[PDB]
mmCIF file with all atom_site columns, C-alpha atoms in Angstrom:
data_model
loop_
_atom_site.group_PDB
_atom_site.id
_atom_site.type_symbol
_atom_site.label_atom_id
_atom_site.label_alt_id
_atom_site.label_comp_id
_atom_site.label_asym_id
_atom_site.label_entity_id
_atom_site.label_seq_id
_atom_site.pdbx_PDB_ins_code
_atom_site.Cartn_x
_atom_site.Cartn_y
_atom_site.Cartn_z
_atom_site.occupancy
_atom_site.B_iso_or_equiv
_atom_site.pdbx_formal_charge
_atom_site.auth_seq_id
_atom_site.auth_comp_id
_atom_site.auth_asym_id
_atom_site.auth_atom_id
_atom_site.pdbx_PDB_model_num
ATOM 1  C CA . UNK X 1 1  ? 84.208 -10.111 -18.637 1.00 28.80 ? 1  UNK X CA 1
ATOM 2  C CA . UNK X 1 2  ? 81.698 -9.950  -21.764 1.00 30.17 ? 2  UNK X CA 1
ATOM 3  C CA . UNK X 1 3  ? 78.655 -7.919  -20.180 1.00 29.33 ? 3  UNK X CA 1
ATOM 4  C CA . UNK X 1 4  ? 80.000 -5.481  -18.368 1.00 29.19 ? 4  UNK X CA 1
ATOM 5  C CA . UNK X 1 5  ? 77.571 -2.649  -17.782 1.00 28.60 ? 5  UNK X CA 1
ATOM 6  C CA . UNK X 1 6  ? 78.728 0.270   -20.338 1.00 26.87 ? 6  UNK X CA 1
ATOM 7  C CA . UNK X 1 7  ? 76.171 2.366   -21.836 1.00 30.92 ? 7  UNK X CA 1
ATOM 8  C CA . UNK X 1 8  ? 76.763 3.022   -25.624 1.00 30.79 ? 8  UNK X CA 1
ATOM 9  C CA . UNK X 1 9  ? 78.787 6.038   -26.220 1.00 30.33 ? 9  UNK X CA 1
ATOM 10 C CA . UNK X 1 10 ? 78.039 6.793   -29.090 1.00 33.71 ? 10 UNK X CA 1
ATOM 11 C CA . UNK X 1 11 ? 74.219 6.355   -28.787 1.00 27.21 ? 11 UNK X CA 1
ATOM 12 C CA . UNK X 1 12 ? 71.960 8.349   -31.513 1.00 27.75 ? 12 UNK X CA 1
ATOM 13 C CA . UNK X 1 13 ? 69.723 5.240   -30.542 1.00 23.46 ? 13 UNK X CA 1
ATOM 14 C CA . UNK X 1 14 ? 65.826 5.676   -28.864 1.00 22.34 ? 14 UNK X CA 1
ATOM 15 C CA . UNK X 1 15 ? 65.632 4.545   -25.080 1.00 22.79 ? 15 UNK X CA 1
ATOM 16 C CA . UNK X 1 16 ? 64.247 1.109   -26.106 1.00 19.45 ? 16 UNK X CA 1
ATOM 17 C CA . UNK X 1 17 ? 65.549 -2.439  -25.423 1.00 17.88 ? 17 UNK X CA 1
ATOM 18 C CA . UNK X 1 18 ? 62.633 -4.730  -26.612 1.00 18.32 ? 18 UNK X CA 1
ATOM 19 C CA . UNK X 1 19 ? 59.453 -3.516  -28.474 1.00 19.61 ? 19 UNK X CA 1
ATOM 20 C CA . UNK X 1 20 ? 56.890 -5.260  -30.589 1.00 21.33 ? 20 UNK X CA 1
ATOM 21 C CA . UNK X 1 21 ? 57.652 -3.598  -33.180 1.00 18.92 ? 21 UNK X CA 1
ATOM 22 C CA . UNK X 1 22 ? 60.126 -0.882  -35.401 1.00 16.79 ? 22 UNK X CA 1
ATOM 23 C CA . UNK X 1 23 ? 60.703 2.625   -35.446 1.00 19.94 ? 23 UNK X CA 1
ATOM 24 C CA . UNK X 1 24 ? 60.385 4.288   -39.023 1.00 16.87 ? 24 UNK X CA 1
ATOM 25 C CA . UNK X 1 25 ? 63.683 5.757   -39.304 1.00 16.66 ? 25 UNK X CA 1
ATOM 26 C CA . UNK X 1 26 ? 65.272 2.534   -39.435 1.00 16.49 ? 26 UNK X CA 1
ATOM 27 C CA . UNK X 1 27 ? 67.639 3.707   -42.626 1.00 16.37 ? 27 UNK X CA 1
ATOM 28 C CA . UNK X 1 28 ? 68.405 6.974   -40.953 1.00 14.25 ? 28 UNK X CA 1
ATOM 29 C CA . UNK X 1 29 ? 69.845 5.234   -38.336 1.00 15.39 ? 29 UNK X CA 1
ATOM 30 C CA . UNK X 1 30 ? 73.603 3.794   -38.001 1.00 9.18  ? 30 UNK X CA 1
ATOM 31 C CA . UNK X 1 31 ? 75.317 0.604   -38.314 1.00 12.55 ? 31 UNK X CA 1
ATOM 32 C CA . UNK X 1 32 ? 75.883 0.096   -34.601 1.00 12.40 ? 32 UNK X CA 1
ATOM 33 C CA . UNK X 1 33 ? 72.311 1.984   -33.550 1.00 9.54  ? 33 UNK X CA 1
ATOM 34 C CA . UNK X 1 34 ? 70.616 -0.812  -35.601 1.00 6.92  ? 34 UNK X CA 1
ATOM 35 C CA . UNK X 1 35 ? 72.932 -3.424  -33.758 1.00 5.38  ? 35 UNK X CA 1
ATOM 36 C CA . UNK X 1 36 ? 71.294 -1.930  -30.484 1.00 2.00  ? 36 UNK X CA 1
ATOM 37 C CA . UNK X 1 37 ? 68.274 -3.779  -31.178 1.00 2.53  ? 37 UNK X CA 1
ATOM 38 C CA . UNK X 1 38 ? 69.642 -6.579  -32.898 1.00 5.14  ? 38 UNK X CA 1
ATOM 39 C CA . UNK X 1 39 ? 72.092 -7.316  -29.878 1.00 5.41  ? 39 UNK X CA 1
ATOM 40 C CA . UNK X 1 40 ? 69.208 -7.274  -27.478 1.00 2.37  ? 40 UNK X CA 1
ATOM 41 C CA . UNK X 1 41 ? 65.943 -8.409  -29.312 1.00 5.50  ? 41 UNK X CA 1
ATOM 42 C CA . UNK X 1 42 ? 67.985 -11.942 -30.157 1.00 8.92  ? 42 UNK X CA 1
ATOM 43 C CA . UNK X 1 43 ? 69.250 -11.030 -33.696 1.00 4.73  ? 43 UNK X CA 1
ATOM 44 C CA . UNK X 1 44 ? 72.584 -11.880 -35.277 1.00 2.05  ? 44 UNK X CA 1
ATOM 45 C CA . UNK X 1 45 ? 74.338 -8.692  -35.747 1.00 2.00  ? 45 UNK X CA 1
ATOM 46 C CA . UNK X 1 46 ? 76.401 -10.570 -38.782 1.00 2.00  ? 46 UNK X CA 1
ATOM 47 C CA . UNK X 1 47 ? 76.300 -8.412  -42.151 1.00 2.00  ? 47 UNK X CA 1
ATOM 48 C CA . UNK X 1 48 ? 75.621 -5.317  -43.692 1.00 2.00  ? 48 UNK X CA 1
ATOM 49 C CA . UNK X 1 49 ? 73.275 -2.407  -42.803 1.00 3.14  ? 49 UNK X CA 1
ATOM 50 C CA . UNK X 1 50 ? 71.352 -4.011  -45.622 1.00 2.00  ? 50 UNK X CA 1
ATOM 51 C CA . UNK X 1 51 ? 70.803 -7.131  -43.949 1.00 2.00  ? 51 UNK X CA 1
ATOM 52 C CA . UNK X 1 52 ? 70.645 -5.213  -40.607 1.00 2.00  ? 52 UNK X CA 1
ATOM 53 C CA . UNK X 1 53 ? 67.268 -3.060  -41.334 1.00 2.45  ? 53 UNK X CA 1
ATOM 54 C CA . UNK X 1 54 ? 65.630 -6.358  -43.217 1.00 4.21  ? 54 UNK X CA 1
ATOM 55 C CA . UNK X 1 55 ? 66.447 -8.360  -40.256 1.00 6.17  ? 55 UNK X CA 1
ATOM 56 C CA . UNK X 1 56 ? 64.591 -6.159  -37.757 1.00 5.73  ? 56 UNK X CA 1
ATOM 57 C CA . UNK X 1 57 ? 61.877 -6.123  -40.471 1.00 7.73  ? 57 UNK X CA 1
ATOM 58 C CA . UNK X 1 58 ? 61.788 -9.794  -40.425 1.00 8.07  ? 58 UNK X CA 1
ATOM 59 C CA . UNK X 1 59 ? 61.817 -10.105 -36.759 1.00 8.94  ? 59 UNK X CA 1
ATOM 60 C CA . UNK X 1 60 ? 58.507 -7.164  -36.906 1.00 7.21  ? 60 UNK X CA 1
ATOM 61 C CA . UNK X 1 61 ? 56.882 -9.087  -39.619 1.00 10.47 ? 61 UNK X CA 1
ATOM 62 C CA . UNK X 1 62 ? 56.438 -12.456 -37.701 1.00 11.24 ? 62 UNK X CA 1
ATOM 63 C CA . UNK X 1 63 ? 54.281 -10.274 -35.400 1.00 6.92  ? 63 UNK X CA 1
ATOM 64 C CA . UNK X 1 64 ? 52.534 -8.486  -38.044 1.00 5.05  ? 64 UNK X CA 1
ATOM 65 C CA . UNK X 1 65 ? 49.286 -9.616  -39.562 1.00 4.77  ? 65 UNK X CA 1
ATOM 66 C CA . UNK X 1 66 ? 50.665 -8.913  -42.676 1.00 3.90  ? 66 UNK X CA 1
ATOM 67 C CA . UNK X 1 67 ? 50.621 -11.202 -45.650 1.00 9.45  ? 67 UNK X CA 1
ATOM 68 C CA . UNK X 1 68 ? 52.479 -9.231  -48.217 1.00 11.55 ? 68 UNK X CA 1
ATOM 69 C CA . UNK X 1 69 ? 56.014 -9.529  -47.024 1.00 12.65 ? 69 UNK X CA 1
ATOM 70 C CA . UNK X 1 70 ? 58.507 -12.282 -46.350 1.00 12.50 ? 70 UNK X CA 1
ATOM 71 C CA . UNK X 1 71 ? 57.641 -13.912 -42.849 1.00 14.96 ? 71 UNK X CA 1
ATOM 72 C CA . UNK X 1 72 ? 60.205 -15.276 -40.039 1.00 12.24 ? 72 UNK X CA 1
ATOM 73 C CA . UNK X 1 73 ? 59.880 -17.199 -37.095 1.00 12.63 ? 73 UNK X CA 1
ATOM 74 C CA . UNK X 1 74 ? 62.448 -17.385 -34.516 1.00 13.01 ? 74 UNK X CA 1
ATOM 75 C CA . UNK X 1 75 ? 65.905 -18.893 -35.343 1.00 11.56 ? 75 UNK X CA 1
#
């Protein structure tokens, strides 16, 4: 009824479902390419493309090393 297999039309999206980490041309995606990821590495697809690229960052940055930028564990 929900997940019904249907690849994304519209996809200007990499072949990826779940990486460790984020591709570089996170802003040059779309809305709905960044919701790819969101949808499937357990992210809440709620807000704007704003939110959208610093949530992916967040969920990169718990599993970087890196002590410069705002860290996240799961939710």
């Amino acid at each position: 009824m929900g997940h019904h297999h249907h690849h994304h039309s519209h996809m200007s999206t990499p072949l990826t479902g779940k990486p460790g980490a984020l591709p570089a041309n996170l802003d040059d995606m779309k809305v709905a390419e960044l919701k790819q990821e969101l949808k499937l590495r357990s992210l809440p697809v709620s807000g704007t493309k704003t939110e959208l690229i610093e949530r992916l960052r967040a969920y990169q940055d718990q599993i970087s090393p890196v002590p410069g930028a705002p860290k996240a564990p799961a939710a």
